Write a protein that binds this ligand. Structure first.
Ligand SMILES: [Zn+2]
Ligand SMILES: [Zn+2]
Ligand SMILES: [Zn+2]
Length: 230
């Protein structure tokens, strides 16, 4: 936590020369603050964002941090499924003029989940890789749909040119006691989807997730083993 920066209500952690983790918190009374993590990636003269914060105001703070610390324009944001911790700040991205992308299924589910859809839809091949025409100019972001797990629409993102891959809410840390929120989950296919994420990015050694600090690939294997028991 030495290299963690407090900026407003958020926390930023540099993971690589060109990759930062953003963390926002939603306080639930009686339970305490709950963190949600996303990514900020520099790609030459532009910035790419993975996931919003819980709220519009927090997402505006992410943009403010990028402006202060990097001072380059945000080209696009990818959001990894239609839940509040990943898409709760879509209006802030749109007000800033940032192009937003999500799984077509995320955009179709967003209204039913109390959310605004992204402005562009990603589609995927039968083996999970994104159709490149739907992800134009994504630079180092390599988007992979691993199959239904935490939700039916959850997607994951490898950062090409680094050893980092983002599992979102599909992957839990190697010490996790449970798979988190399973209310929208596909318990039948979860284990295969977790393993497919590991197989898509087989050389990623730092696994970033939504609700725990970055971990080793033991996050992937532990998650799959928990899901085997479902
Ligand atoms: Zn979720
Ligand atoms: Zn739901
Ligand atoms: Zn979550």
């Amino acid at each position: 936590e030495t290299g963690d920066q407090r900026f407003g209500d958020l926390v930023f952690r540099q993971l690589a020369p060109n990759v930062w983790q953003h963390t926002s918190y939603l306080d639930m009374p009686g339970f305490g603050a709950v963190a949600s993590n996303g990514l900020i990636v520099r790609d030459g003269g532009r910035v790419l964002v993975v996931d919003t914060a819980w709220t519009d105001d927090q997402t505006a703070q992410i943009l403010n941090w990028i402006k202060q610390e990097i001072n380059l324009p945000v080209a696009l944001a990818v959001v990894t499924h239609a839940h509040q911790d990943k898409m709760g700040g879509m209006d802030a991205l749109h007000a800033a003029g940032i192009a937003t992308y999500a799984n077509a299924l995320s955009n179709q589910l967003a209204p039913q989940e109390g959310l605004v859809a992204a402005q562009h839809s990603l589609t995927f091949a039968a083996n999970g890789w994104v159709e490149p025409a739907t992800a134009p100019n994504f630079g180092p972001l390599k988007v992979f749909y691993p199959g239904p797990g935490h939700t039916s629409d959850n997607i994951t993102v490898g950062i090409d040119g680094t050893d980092i891959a983002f599992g979102g809410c599909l992957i839990k840390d190697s010490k996790a006691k449970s798979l988190g929120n399973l209310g929208d989950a596909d318990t039948e296919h979860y284990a295969a989807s977790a393993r497919a994420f590991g197989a898509a990015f087989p050389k990623a050694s730092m696994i970033v997730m939504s609700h725990s600090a970055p971990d080793s690939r033991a996050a992937i294997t532990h998650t799959a083993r928990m899901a085997d028991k479902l």
